[PDB]
């Protein structure tokens, strides 16, 4: 460990990998844990907030992009604001030029083009922040998993964070359940609450530690914090 | 002294480049993709390895289309493969502005050939560790090219890359000797899926998904599109019948 | 300290390592090529080596056409060759636009030599791993051949040569000029100088070439063209019948 | 149009037919009142099979004609053999951004082994269109009536020359700004052929 | 010898547990996804750390959380130690 | 130009460029000064290693920024010129922009503010020069003596020294001098400055340069003959007591 | 990676000093010496060329003493190539002050312009400092005759008698003991000439390796006379000093 | 992208010198051996043309270029570093003089501009110093004939006669006793031939030796007549047949 | 010797990672956010008795209702306050109101990521990230009194009672059981000085410590030496009682 090329992103390893890209993936693996899933007409994200003290507050892991779409925070917290600013500009650019809402599929290629310029040139660095892009367009609900390596793939649901991959087992057995649930936002969010519960180790879900955001056709993107999520605990 | 492999522009004492050789090794760590050249056009094929059941079918586009008749498929790192297509799209768009009629296949290869080579000349940027296979129907006949990490390319009657590049390229030589005079565009669609299954022996430990896109003047008439409907399922049963 | 062999700087031995390592990268393809100057024109012959059947011989060419009056032959890797080919065409067309007429062969080899030195003297870029050999017939000196180099020093030759066997080709061709005491071939027809260079090329290389094993460029007065597979095969038949 | 600048005008035209296309122009260039050069030539060669004429401000045409030779030379060696549609688009972009400073009429016509002959005329606005016959300049203003009625489709080589020779004769006698010898270039499957007349020939009918 | 795949690591990790004592409730295919590009030597250290956790906690058998916690313990590419970047 | 950042945090939390720059002052000439009630004095020494230095054409160790405020530097005599020239331009700029004469507090924040830029600017190095800014604000008779450290931290001091043998003079200023009861006359401020230089200059005359700053835009530099008058009276009251 | 090949030309040593600046000072000892003396009626400058021969051209040549102004002459001890950069910029700024205020430029303003240039490359730019040193000599109506010197660090003060070059401490010892405040121009030439004879590496002393440019003021007041001594005039003072 | 090296590749050695220049003089002392001599009636410079290949054409190579019509130049170093330096030397000569003063710069003012380009490469980052040493010799209407020796360090020195190359140690010592105060243009040519002949290890002829002399203004080589102001350039290069004329004269 | 953007196998950056340890190298700033106001305090840490108390100011004023304090190296603090005062006053020009305390913190914390060499797409020139910790306090009309912390890492937390610098461990643990939602403004002033008396090396007085406050009416206010001296005498009665 801590050998070979730690210096720059433009130097290739003898094994055909990139250490700086692999080191950026470790930020999400040890970062704040969060889960997510989606249905045909709806999408739900669940995040677990952390802090350094009991007397402190809990930063929001979900930043609102537009009315029809949003993202989630994982891995490096401060690098989320950089990609969130470039993403909200592209959402408003399509409304002021093309007068159309930015699709989820096309939104993944925009953030992939921003992170690839820093990896292919000196002086820049790949942003180690995880992003789960949800939204609803004429095609339907879509969810994406963003990684510093540039991998963008649409999934029914996934989890990124600390011990988050251990919660994907519940999503596989229930994969045939929530996909057939349409127009039932109450029972759909409960599917994500039971998913993150499998990743709980030290503490459990509390009022201030549970952050749930839902988006759909008849229901726009809304962030539920505080006592709004107390009914889903 | 050590350090020949630290930088890019530094030449090895044997006459090679480590940054170029290490970029080729990253090509064989990605998903495999092949291609078949016909008389009236070319046929592209790619095998996307499915990780888990959470992947939604046919929502991941491996083959990105530049302009209309120019298809592109890459095997390697995802951002390095998408950056060449996004750069090649700006080259095809800037060409039609001044030069009117779209750029042909052999002329489009010079755009990516000089662009990738510009990365190996400077230590400020890195080369592309992805192998891009692009082609289509140009003004005269048809052409197919495979962009290597070193920037070297030629005309390819067939192309093989990825983990199964060893077993896939061996099957391309059998197709040439089978139809030395010419090969129809409809027959190459089923032959493209057959070679993928023959190269699946190395990738058989995971799930696979078939994605085929072809372009010719016989049916689409200068249009590069994917395969949907019963045509895709027909090539699956024909290729799996010989197994 | 030990970075003298990495970036180009004055060495403790008074040499340049990266410049010396650049000559080892020109032979990577291992292609022998020779050119002799006829009376009214100049002919060049280069080996055509197609490693794989999937490569189209018509698309594979190591000889580029810069202009109608200027041919170019490159021995080395194609990605560094096409990078210098697209650049040489930009500077050659700039002369006709800015200065009004066609550039001769000595000036084009002079401008590319000073440009190749920019790839050397500058420490943040690397020199080209190819050797540009321009074949053209001017209006004053007539037939001429100028050979460049990654160091940026252009010099004219009578019969140019390259490849690993260059030492055997130059020595074999030296005995012809020293015995006849002539600076150029006295054959007026451009067909005679083609068959003349093939005879000395086979005996020196010890190999009987085929129709697809050679690429013969022909630079005439105010015209340049590359012989196809049918024209190269036609010359080989007449040699075996006459000699 | 400035005050005192050298202008061309006169009449330039090209007529397509079965075996190819033949262009035409005169040698007279009227600068302001007097005639600056009566022996000059308005023909311009950007390619062996692609020809273009020059009309309007002379300083605008000769500058744009040289820029196109630089773009197509890069297009010929790198990309491939140019066509009539590719060369016509180069004059288009040069007359767009420079439309304010550079305003001149352009007519481009060439030969091809597939589409045979094509004539693409560019007015002062910079549009590009396909027409079998196209005229421009100050001298051609009077020949619109004669060229439209007597024009035929898919003519011979002798009928094409006589059609242009009689057409440009009206643009000379009726307009003093145009005159001199008639320069014509022929594009067929054989090659480029130059044809020139004399004032004592076409004026006698 | 390329790095083992998802289904390849699930078989290797399970064989090292043949001499151990568990409740057979551990999903080895789930543990294979938590292991990203690990060689055959790094996979053996996972079963070693899993046995050390049950000694401190006093567990009579190695459960599923022992392998998950063993990954969080320092083996390869693991640091922790009250380091939080927020 | 050169965009590479020279300043790098040490794993302990310090900075190599900032820490090593502080030793350029400790190897330089000792600059000590004190302030009284209505007056302030800034002393400095000179290097005795080389002789035959013309005093008239030699630039003074205490540079005059303005009529009511001056500057006394130490350490490197090279990088000190960049801070003095830019401070004098700001003196005329602040006088032009706000139509107000510059004060001592604003001039100190500017000189310290410029040093904070080079530490935060990639491609440059911080100053190894420590400057002592003293003067009198307009319509104010209270002297303001502010220390400017190479790290960019500024502070006010009644009696403070910088340069070589600093710990020796600082212990001398904390005993024989009282901050709560400074001297009310100018003569006592000059005699205290000379005594502070006796532990460094070590029996010298032409190597001592003392500049007296007075309110109402009055700057009087003590000549070589006037400094020796105070040295004679102190040496008689030193060995005999 | 640009971090490895960069040697960090400007950084602070653990002792609190600069690396390349200390190494640039050693180049002065390995270069030609420069000596000058400020007298009452003028300033006498002197230097010596290094690595000479018979094939050298002594007709008109000076490799050390340059003239930046009619009233101001300088001396170059160090690398000659690094001097030509500042000599060109010095004549620009000296004439810019005359272009603006329409009067002759003093020495102090001319020194600080080139001194700030040396400080710019040491503080920023990531380049190497100037390996050349200068000795400034001139006259004005402000402070009178002024004699300064420069260093690659960019620090300058006034000097009555200064020696910068080979054998710095050896030449300054003989100049200090024989220095006098009443020394005239004729007496200052003998002191500067006898120092170069004892401190050189050769046996005898010829007029080819010596260069002298003085400053004299005649009956004309307000403008001095800057005259570079030619080898014909250099061999004349060798007899008066007794060296011959 | 652009250039990420702004730092000077030439650093001060702990011994008080520059490592790049100390090794630059080594590349000058090993290579083609040139020479030069100045006389009262003109300046005579000469150099040897080495043969890398027996089929190489010596006429296509110019070892003595032309800066200004009155000033020639010769180089003992590497070919490429000479051409770019001279191509930039003619630009600064026409821009700063022909486009300002209108005439050509003299020998003393031209060597300062040529050495100005080399001295900037020894400092500014991203570039390396020139490993060539140029001999600038010419004639003006005031100072007369003068020959300067441009070192790779950037400093120039005047010399009556000098030689640089592999035989620079032996040839420069010989020129001390072979030069005096009174010489002609043709008399200095035989001196250059006797010195260079001992340094020729290959074929000795006029094709392998480039001999250029600066004589009186020649109206025949000017190209036009009728203007008494310009009588033609003083720089002239002897052809292959003209060089062989004085080789047998020894 | 490497780039400032270099990642670590720990998943974090180099550089800034060390800036977090540089906070303990300076003084100790302690503050408590109550319902009646926010009481902030710092430590002057005078190394010599001749240093003026009014000289070193570690508590600045961004707005009448918004103020902060600095700890650790104060060289990087001045550069942040220049932009913090600018972004707050410039926001008054655009929106004709006072910027929120939480909204202002997000704009200030974005300055820690500006380090880099040759940034592409725009011009951002920074040699090193800010190694100073700032406690952002204030009051708004929505959430009420807020006390934040500006970390060099670029993130921020809203603390009820926070102790930074050398007291980030010992002095921070005491704030857990000594804080309550009903704590008044007068009792919070003596509670801060209760910890400052133990954590200070020398004796606690008005010259060795400077405290401030932020209220709804008067806003930001700095305690006078006479007001501070009255709280020291009342602190001795709260220490020794029974």
- Whose tokens are 């030195």? That residue is C117
* Contact assessment for residue G191 and residue G183, using Cβ atoms and an 8 Å cutoff: yes
What is the residue whose two structure tokens read 């139509």?
F99
- Check which CATH number belongs to the domain holding I157 and give it: 3.60.20.10
G46 with G238: CB under 8 angstroms?
no
- Give resolution, Å, one decimal: 3.8
Treating both helix axes as pointing N-terminal to C-terminal, what angle do C78-98 and B105-121 enclose, rounded to 10 degrees? 100
CATH of the domain at A227: 3.60.20.10
What is the rounded CA–CA span in Å between residue F30 and residue F50?
17
Instruction: Name residues whose C-beta falls within 8 Å of residue A109's C-beta, 6 or more positions apart in sequence.
Output: A152, B82
Phi-psi category of residue H150: left, alpha or beta, with phi > 0 → left and psi -120 to 50 → alpha: beta
Q: Phi/psi of residue G118, each to 5°? A: -65, -35
What is chain F's length? 241
Nearest chain E Cα to B204, which residue? Answer: E7
Q: What is the DSSP letter of D30?
A: E
Smallest Cβ distance to D85: which of B98, B100, B107? B100
Of A16, A155, A172, the CB nearest to B56: A155
User: 3-state DSSP: chain D helix, strand, coil percent, rounded to 5?
Assistant: 35, 30, 40
Q: Report d(CA G188, CA G170) in Å as an integer.
A: 18
Give all domains of chain H, ordered by start, each with its CATH number. 1-249 (3.60.20.10)
Which CATH architecture does the domain made up of D7-205 adopt?
4-Layer Sandwich (3.60)
CA dist list (Å): D56 to D42, D95, D96, D102 = 11, 13, 16, 10
What ranges make up the beta strands (E) of chain C? 33-37, 42-47, 63-65, 70-75, 131-137, 143-147, 155-156, 160-161, 214-220, 223-226
Chains touching D (3+ CB pairs < 8 Å): B, C
Closest CA to D124 of D9, D4, D26, D3: D9
CATH superfamily of F1-240: Aminohydrolase, N-terminal nucleophile (Ntn) domain (3.60.20.10)
B86 Cβ contact list (under 8 Å, min separation 6): A113
Nearest-angstrom CA–CA distance, G37 and G45:
7
Distance CA B92, CA B68 (A): 10
Q: What DSSP letter does each residue of I28-56 carry, written as one string?
A: --EEEE-SS-EEEEEE---SSTTB-TTT-
Task: Yes or no: say if A130 and A71 are a contact pair by the CB < 8 Å rule.
Answer: no
Q: Element (H or E) spanning D104, and its range?
A: strand D104-110
The answer to whether I151 contacts E86, with C-beta atoms less than 8 Å apart, is yes
Strand partners, C132: C74
- The partner residue sitting opposite H11, judged by closest CB among G7, G27, G85, is G7
- Active-site residue, selected from the candidate residues B2, B31, B101, B161: B31
Q: Which two tokens stand for residue G233?
A: 């005039």
- Which helix (H) or strand (E) element contains residue F20? helix F16-21
Q: What is the DSSP letter of D77?
A: I
Report DSSP letters for H66-122, one per residue: EEETTEEEEE-S-HHHHHHHHHHHHHHHIIIIITTTSS---HHHHHHHHHHHHHHHT
Give the Cα-Cα-Cα angle D100, D104, D105 (nearest 5 degrees).
Answer: 135
Q: Is the dihedral of CA A154, A157, A162, A165 positive or negative?
A: negative
CA pair distance F136, F146, nearest whole angstrom:
12
Q: Would you list the domain boundaries of chain F?
A: 1-240
Q: Which of I50, I56, I54 is nearest to F173 (CA)?
A: I50
Chains that touch F (3 or more CB pairs under 8 A): G, H, I
Helix (H, G, I), strand (E, B) or coil at C51: coil
DSSP string, G63-74: SSEEESSSSEEE
Residues contacting residue G69 through CB under 8 Å, at least 6 positions apart: G94, G104, G105, G110, G138
Backbone angles phi, psi at A98, to 5 degrees: -85, -10
Contact A20/B at CB under 8 A:
no
Cα separation of I43 and I211, whole Å? 9
Please list every residue in chain E whose beta carbon sits closer than 8 Å to the beta carbon of residue A158.
none
Handedness of CA D154, D157, D159, D160 (dihedral sign): positive
State how far the Cα of D118 lies from the Cα of D112, in Å rounded to an integer: 8
Q: Residue H13: exposed, middle, or buried by beta-carbon count in 10 A (0-12, 13-18, 19+)?
A: middle
Which CATH number belongs to the domain containing residue B49 in this structure?
Answer: 3.60.20.10
How buried is residue I116: exposed, middle or buried, by Cβ count under 10 Å (0-12/13-18/19+)? buried
As a whole number of angstroms, the distance between CA I175 and CA A219 comes to 43
Chains that touch I (3 or more CB pairs under 8 A): A, E, F, G
Closest C-alpha to H233, from H60, H42, H87, H75:
H42
Helix/strand/coil for G176: helix
Report how far residue H202's alpha carbon sits from residue A42's, in angstroms, rounded to the nearest whole number: 88
Chain H residue numbers with beta carbons less than 8 Å from the beta carbon of G131 are 12, 18
CA distance B64 to B36: 17
CB count within 10 Å of CB A15 equals 15
Provide the CA I91 distance to its chain's centre, in angstroms: 22
Residues β-bridged to residue H34? H47, H164
Instruction: CATH number of the domain at C218, please.
Output: 3.60.20.10
Residue C178: enclosing H or E segment and its boundaries? Answer: helix C166-180
Asked if F56 and G143 count as a contact pair (C-beta separation under 8 A), the reply is: yes
Q: Tokens 């910890």 label which residue?
A: I195
End-to-end Cα spacing for chain I: 59
Q: Give me the DSSP letters along F88-156.
A: HHHHHHHHHHSSS---HHHHHHHHHHHHHHHHHSTTB------EEEEEE-TT--SEEEEEE-TTS-EEE
Closest partner CB to F155 (pick from I24, I56, I75)? I56
| Inter-chain touch H159–G56, beta carbons under 8 Å | yes
Burial of F202 (0-12, 13-18, 19+ CB in 10 A): exposed
Task: Round to whole Å and give the CA distance between I158 and I150.
Answer: 10
Q: Which fold has domain G1-244?
A: 3.60.20
Chain H residue at shortest CA distance from F1: H6
Number of H helices, E strands in chain A: 6, 9
Our answer on whether B and H touch (3+ beta-carbon pairs < 8 Å) is: yes
CB I60 within 8 A of CB I70: yes
Which residue in E3, E34, E76 has the most chain A C-beta atoms within 10 A of its own C-beta, making it the best mutation to test that interface?
E34
Question: 């992805």: which residue's tokens?
Answer: B130
- For chain E, positions 9-38, list CB contacts with chain I under 8 A: none
Q: Which residues in chain B have Cβ-Cβ distances shorter than 8 Å to G2?
A: 123
CA distance E76 to chain A (A): 8
Residues from chain G contacting residue I14 (CB–CB below 8 Å)? none
Six token digits for residue D114 = 């597939």
Q: How far apart are CA F17 and CA H240, in angstroms?
A: 65
The nearest alpha carbon in chain F to G121 belongs to F124
Q: Are C57 and B156 in contact (CB under 8 A)?
A: no
Neighbours of chain H (3+ CB pairs under 8 A): B, C, F, G
Domain that holds residue C74: 2-242
**Chain H window 2-61: which residues touch B at a Cβ cutoff of 8 Å?**
2-4
Which residue from A76, A69, A79 is spatially nearest to A106, judged by alpha carbons? A69
Asked whether the CA dihedral A38, A44, A48, A51 is positive or negative, the reply is positive
Distance from CA of G126 to the nearest CA of B (A): 18
Domain ranges for chain G: 1-244
Whether H153 contacts chain G with CB within 8 A: yes
CA B224 to mean position of chain CA atoms: 14
Dihedral-angle region of residue C44 (phi above 0 means left; psi in -120 to 50 means alpha; beta otherwise) = beta
Beta carbons within 10 angstroms of residue H182's beta carbon: 8
Q: Does C59 touch chain B (CB under 8 A)?
A: yes
Place of tokens 């058989």: B204
| DSSP secondary structure letters along chain B | ---TTTSSSPPPTTS--HHHHHHHHTGGGS--EEEEE-SSEEEEEEEEEE-STTBPTT-S--EEEETTTEEEEEES-HHHHHHHHHHHHHHHHHHHHHH-SPP-HHHHHHHHHHHHHHHHHBSSB----SEEEEEE--SSS-EEEEE-TTS---BBSEEEESTTHHHHHHHHHHHHHHSSS---HHHHHHHHHHHHHHTTTTTTTSEEEEEEEEEETTTTSS--EE--THHHHHHHHHHHH--
Among partner residues E2, E5, E33, which is closest to B206 by beta-carbon distance?
Answer: E5
The technique by which this structure was obtained is: cryo-EM
**E53 C-beta neighbours (distance < 10 Å), count:** 18
Which of B1, B7, B18 is the best mutation test for G, with the most CBs of G within 10 A? Answer: B7
User: In 3D, which of A185, A165, A168 has the Cα closest to residue A38?
Assistant: A185
Using CA atoms, how far apart are residues D149 and G51, in angstroms rounded to an integer? Answer: 94
The answer to whether residue E12 neighbours chain A at the CB level (below 8 Å) is no
List Cα–Cα distances, C81 to B21, B126, C219, F112, in angstroms: 19, 20, 20, 56
Query: Token pair of B224, please?
Result: 């590069």
Report the alpha-carbon distance of residue G164 to residue B63 in Å, rounded.
73
Burial, E4: exposed, middle or buried (Cβ in 10 Å; 0-12, 13-18, 19+)?
Answer: buried
Active site residue B31: yes
Q: Is F209 exposed, middle or buried (0-12, 13-18, 19+ CB in 10 A)?
A: buried
The CA distances from residue I178 to H192, I36, I175, in Å, are 100, 16, 5
Q: What is the DSSP letter of E14?
A: H
- Residue G5 with chain C: CB contacts under 8 Å: 3, 6-7, 123
Q: Note whether A7 contacts G3, CB cutoff 8 Å.
A: yes
List the catalytic residues of D: 10
């Amino acid at each position: 460990f801590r050998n070979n090329y730690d210096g720059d992103t433009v130097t290739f390893s003898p094994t055909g990998r990139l250490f700086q890209v692999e080191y950026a993936l470790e930020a999400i693996k040890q970062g704040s844990v969060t889960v997510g899933l989606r249905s045909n007409t709806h999408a739900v994200l669940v995040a677990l907030k952390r802090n350094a003290d009991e007397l402190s507050s809990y930063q929001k892991k979900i930043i609102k992009c537009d009315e029809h779409m949003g993202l989630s925070l994982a891995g490096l917290a401060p690098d989320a604001r950089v990609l969130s600013n470039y993403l909200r500009q592209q959402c408003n650019y399509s409304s002021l030029v093309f007068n159309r809402k930015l699709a989820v599929e096309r939104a993944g290629h925009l953030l992939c083009d921003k992170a690839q310029k820093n990896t292919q040139s000196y002086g820049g660095r790949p942003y180690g922040v995880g992003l789960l892009i949800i939204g609803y367009d004429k095609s339907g609900a879509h969810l994406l998993e963003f990684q510093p390596s540039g991998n963008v793939t649409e999934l029914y649901g996934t989890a990124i964070g600390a011990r988050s991959q251990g919660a994907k087992t519940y999503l596989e057995r229930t994969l045939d359940t929530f996909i057939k649930i349409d127009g039932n936002p109450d029972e759909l969010i409960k599917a994500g609450v039971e998913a993150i519960s499998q990743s709980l180790r030290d503490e459990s879900l509390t009022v201030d530690n549970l952050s749930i955001a839902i988006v759909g056709k008849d229901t726009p993107f809304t962030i539920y914090d505080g006592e709004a999520v107390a009914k889903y605990i | 002294g050590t350090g020949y492999d630290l930088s890019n522009s530094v030449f090895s004492p044997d006459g090679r480049n480590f940054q170029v050789e290490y970029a080729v090794k990253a090509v064989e760590n990605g998903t495999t993709s092949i291609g078949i050249k016909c008389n009236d056009g070319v046929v592209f094929a790619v095998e996307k390895l499915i990780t888990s059941k959470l992947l939604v079918p046919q929502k991941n586009v491996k083959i990105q289309v530049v302009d209309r008749h120019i298809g592109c498929v890459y095997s390697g790192l995802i951002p390095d493969g998408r950056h060449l297509v996004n750069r090649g799209r700006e080259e095809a768009a800037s060409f039609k502005k001044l030069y009117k009629t779209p750029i042909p296949i052999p002329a489009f290869a010079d755009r990516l050939g000089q662009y990738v080579q510009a990365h190996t000349l400077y230590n400020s940027v890195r080369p592309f560790g992805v192998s891009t296979i692009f082609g289509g129907v140009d003004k005269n006949g048809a052409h197919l090219y495979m962009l290597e990490p070193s920037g070297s390319y030629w005309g390819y009657k067939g192309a093989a890359t990825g983990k199964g590049r060893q077993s896939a390229k061996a099957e391309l030589e059998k197709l040439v000797d089978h139809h030395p005079e010419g090969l129809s565009a409809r027959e190459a669609v089923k032959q493209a899926a057959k070679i993928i299954y023959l190269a699946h022996e190395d990738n058989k430990e995971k799930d696979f998904e078939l994605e085929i896109s072809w372009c010719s003047l016989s049916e689409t008439n200068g249009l590069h599109k994917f395969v949907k409907g019963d045509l895709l399922q027909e090539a699956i049963d024909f290729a799996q019948k010989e197994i | 300290a030990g970075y003298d062999r990495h970036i180009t700087i004055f060495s403790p031995e008074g040499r340049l390592y990266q410049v010396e390592y650049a000559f080892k990268a020109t032979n990577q393809t291992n292609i022998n090529s020779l050119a002799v100057r006829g009376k009214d024109c100049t002919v060049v012959i280069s080996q055509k080596k197609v490693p794989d059947k999937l490569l189209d011989p018509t698309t594979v060419s190591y000889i580029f056409c810069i202009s109608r009056t200027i041919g170019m032959v490159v021995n080395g890797p194609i990605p560094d060759a096409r990078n210098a080919a697209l650049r040489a065409k930009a500077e050659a067309a700039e002369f006709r636009y800015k200065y009004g007429y066609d550039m001769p062969c000595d000036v084009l080899a002079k401008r590319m030599a000073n440009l190749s030195q920019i790839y050397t003297q500058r420490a943040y870029m690397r020199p080209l791993g190819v050797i540009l050999t321009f074949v053209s017939v001017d209006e004053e000196l007539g037939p001429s051949i100028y050979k460049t180099d990654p160091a940026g020093y252009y010099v004219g030759y009578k019969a140019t040569a390259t490849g690993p066997k260059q030492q055997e080709i130059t020595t074999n061709l030296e005995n012809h000029f020293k015995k006849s005491k002539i600076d150029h071939i006295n054959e007026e027809s451009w067909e005679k100088v083609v068959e003349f260079a093939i005879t000395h090329m086979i005996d020196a290389l010890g190999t009987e070439f085929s129709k697809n094993d050679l690429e013969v460029g022909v630079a005439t007065k105010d015209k340049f063209f590359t012989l196809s597979a049918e024209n190269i095969e036609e010359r080989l038949v007449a040699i075996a019948e006459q000699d | 149009l400035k005050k005192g600048e050298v202008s061309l005008g006169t009449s330039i035209m090209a007529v397509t037919f079965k075996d190819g296309v033949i262009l035409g122009a005169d040698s007279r260039t009227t600068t302001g009142a007097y005639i600056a050069n009566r022996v000059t030539d308005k023909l311009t060669r950007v390619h062996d099979k692609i020809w273009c004429c020059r009309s309007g401000s002379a300083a605008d045409t000769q500058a744009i004609a040289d820029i196109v030779q630089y773009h197509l030379e890069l297009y010929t060696s790198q990309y491939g053999t140019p066509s009539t549609e590719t060369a016509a688009s180069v004059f288009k972009e040069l007359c767009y951004e420079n439309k304010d400073n550079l305003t001149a009429g352009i007519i481009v016509a060439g030969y091809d082994d597939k589409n045979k002959g094509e004539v693409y005329t560019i007015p002062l606005g910079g549009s590009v269109h396909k027409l079998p016959y196209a005229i421009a300049g100050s001298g051609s203003t009077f020949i619109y009536g004669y060229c439209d009625k007597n024009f035929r489709e898919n003519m011979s080589k002798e009928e094409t020359v006589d059609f242009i020779k009689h057409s440009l004769s009206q643009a000379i006698k009726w307009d003093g700004s145009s005159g001199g010898v008639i320069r014509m270039v022929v594009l067929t499957a054989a090659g480029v052929e130059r044809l020139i007349f004399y004032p004592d020939e076409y004026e006698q009918l | 010898f390329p790095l083992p795949s998802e289904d390849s690591r699930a078989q290797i990790l399970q064989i090292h547990s043949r001499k151990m004592t568990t409740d057979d409730d551990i999903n080895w295919q789930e543990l294979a996804r938590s292991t990203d590009e690990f060689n055959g030597a790094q996979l053996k250290a996972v079963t070693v750390e899993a046995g050390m956790i049950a000694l401190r906690n006093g567990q009579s058998s190695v459960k599923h959380e022992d392998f998950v916690e063993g990954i969080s313990e320092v083996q390869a590419r693991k640091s922790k130690s009250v380091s939080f970047y927020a | 130009g050169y965009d590479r950042a020279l300043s790098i945090f040490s794993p302990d939390g310090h900075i190599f460029q900032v820490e090593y720059a502080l030793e350029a002052v400790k190897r330089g000439t000792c600059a000590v000064g004190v302030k009284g009630k209505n007056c302030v004095v800034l002393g400095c020494e000179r290097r005795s290693t080389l002789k035959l230095q013309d005093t008239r054409i030699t630039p003074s160790k205490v540079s005059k920024i303005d009529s009511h405020v001056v500057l006394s530097f130490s350490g490197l005599n090279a990088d000190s010129r960049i801070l003095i020239e830019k401070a004098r331009v700001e003196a005329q700029s602040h006088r032009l922009t706000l139509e107000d004469p510059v004060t001592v507090e604003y001039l100190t924040r500017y000189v310290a503010g410029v040093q904070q830029r080079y530490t935060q600017s990639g491609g440059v190095r911080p100053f190894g020069v420590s400057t002592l800014i003293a003067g009198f604000d307009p319509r104010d008779d209270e002297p303001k003596l502010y220390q400017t450290e190479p790290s960019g931290i500024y502070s006010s001091w009644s009696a403070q020294t910088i340069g070589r043998n600093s710990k020796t003079v600082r212990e001398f200023l904390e005993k024989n001098y009282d901050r709560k009861e400074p001297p009310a006359t100018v003569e006592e401020c000059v005699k205290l400055t000379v005594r502070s230089l006796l532990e460094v200059v070590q029996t010298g005359a032409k190597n001592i340069e003392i500049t007296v700053v007075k309110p109402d835009s009055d700057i009087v530099a003590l000549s070589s003959e006037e400094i020796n008058q105070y040295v004679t009276q102190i040496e008689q009251e030193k060995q005999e007591q | 990676g640009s971090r490895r090949y960069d040697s960090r030309t400007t950084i602070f040593s653990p002792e609190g000093r600069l690396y390349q600046v200390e190494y640039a000072l050693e180049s002065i000892s390995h270069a030609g010496t420069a000596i000058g003396i400020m007298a009452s009626d003028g300033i006498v400058l002197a230097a010596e060329r290094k690595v000479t021969s018979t094939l050298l051209e002594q007709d008109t040549s000076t490799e050390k003493l340059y003239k930046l102004n009619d009233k101001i002459a300088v001396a170059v001890a160090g690398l000659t190539a690094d001097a030509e950069i500042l000599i060109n910029t010095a004549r620009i700024h000296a004439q810019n002050y005359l272009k603006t205020y329409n009067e002759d430029i003093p020495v102090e303003i001319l020194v600080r312009r080139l001194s700030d240039i040396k400080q710019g490359y040491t503080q920023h730019g990531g380049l190497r400092p100037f390996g050349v040193s200068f000795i400034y000599a001139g006259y004005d109506d402000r402070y009178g005759y002024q004699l300064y010197t420069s260093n690659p660090s960019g620090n300058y003060t006034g000097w009555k008698a200064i020696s910068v070059g080979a054998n710095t401490s050896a030449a300054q010892t003989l100049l200090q003991m024989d220095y006098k405040d009443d020394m005239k121009v004729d007496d200052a030439i003998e002191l500067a000439l006898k120092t170069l004879s004892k401190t050189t590496d050769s046996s005898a002393l010829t007029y080819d390796r010596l260069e002298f440019a003085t400053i004299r003021k005649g009956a004309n007041d307000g403008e001095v006379y800057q005259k570079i001594f030619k080898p014909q005039e250099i061999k004349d003072i060798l007899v008066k000093t007794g060296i011959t | 992208m652009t250039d990420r090296y702004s730092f000077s590749l030439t650093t001060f050695s702990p011994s008080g010198k520059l490592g790049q220049i100390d090794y630059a003089l080594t590349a000058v002392k090993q290579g083609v051996t040139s020479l030069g001599i100045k006389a009262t009636n003109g300046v005579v410079i000469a150099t040897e043309k080495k043969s890398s290949s027996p089929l190489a054409m010596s006429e296509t190579l110019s070892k003595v270029s032309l800066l200004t019509p009155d000033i020639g130049a010769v180089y003992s170093g590497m070919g490429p570093d000479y051409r770019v330096l001279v191509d930039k030397s003619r630009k600064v000569a026409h821009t700063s003089y022909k486009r300002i003063y209108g005439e050509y710069p003299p020998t003393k003012l031209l060597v300062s501009e040529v050495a100005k380009i080399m001295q900037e490469a020894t400092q500014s980052g991203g570039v390396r110093p020139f490993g060539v040493s140029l001999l600038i010799a010419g004639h003006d209407e005031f100072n007369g004939f003068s020959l300067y020796q441009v070192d790779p360090s950037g400093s120039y020195f005047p010399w009556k006669a000098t030689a640089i190359g592999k035989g620079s140690v032996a040839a420069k010592t010989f020129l001390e006793k072979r030069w005096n105060d009174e010489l002609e243009l043709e008399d200095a040519i035989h001196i250059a031939l006797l010195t260079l002949k001992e340094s020729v290890e290959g074929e000795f002829n006029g094709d392998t030796i480039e001999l250029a002399i600066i004589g009186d203004e020649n109206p025949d080589l000017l190209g036009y007549t009728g203007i008494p102001t310009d009588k033609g350039p003083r720089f002239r290069k002897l052809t292959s047949q003209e060089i062989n004329d004085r080789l047998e004269a020894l | 010797d490497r780039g400032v953007s270099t990642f670590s196998p720990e998943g974090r950056l180099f550089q800034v990672e060390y800036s977090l340890e540089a906070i303990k190298l300076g003084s100790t700033a302690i503050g408590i956010a109550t319902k009646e106001g926010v009481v902030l305090g710092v430590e002057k840490r005078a190394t010599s008795p001749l240093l003026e108390s009014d000289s070193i100011e570690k508590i600045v004023e961004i707005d009448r209702h918004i103020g902060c304090a600095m700890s650790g190296l104060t060289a990087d603090a001045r550069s942040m306050i220049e932009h913090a005062r600018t972004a707050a006053v410039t926001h008054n020009l655009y929106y004709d109101e006072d910027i929120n305390v939480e909204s202002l913190t997000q704009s200030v914390c974005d300055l820690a990521l500006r380090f880099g060499e040759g940034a592409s797409g725009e011009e951002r020139l920074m040699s090193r990230p800010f190694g100073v910790a700032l406690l952002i306090a204030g009051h708004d009309a929505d959430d009420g009194y807020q006390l934040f912390h500006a970390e060099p890492s670029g993130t921020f937390y809203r603390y009820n009672a926070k102790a930074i610098g050398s007291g980030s461990e010992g002095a921070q643990a005491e704030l857990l059981n000594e804080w309550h939602s009903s704590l008044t403004l007068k009792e919070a002033e003596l509670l801060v000085l209760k910890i400052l008396k133990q954590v200070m090396e020398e004796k606690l007085d008005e010259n060795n410590a400077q405290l401030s406050c932020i209220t709804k009416q008067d806003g930001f206010k700095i305690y006078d030496n006479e007001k501070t001296a009255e709280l020291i005498k009342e602190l001795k009665e709260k220490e020794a009682a029974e």
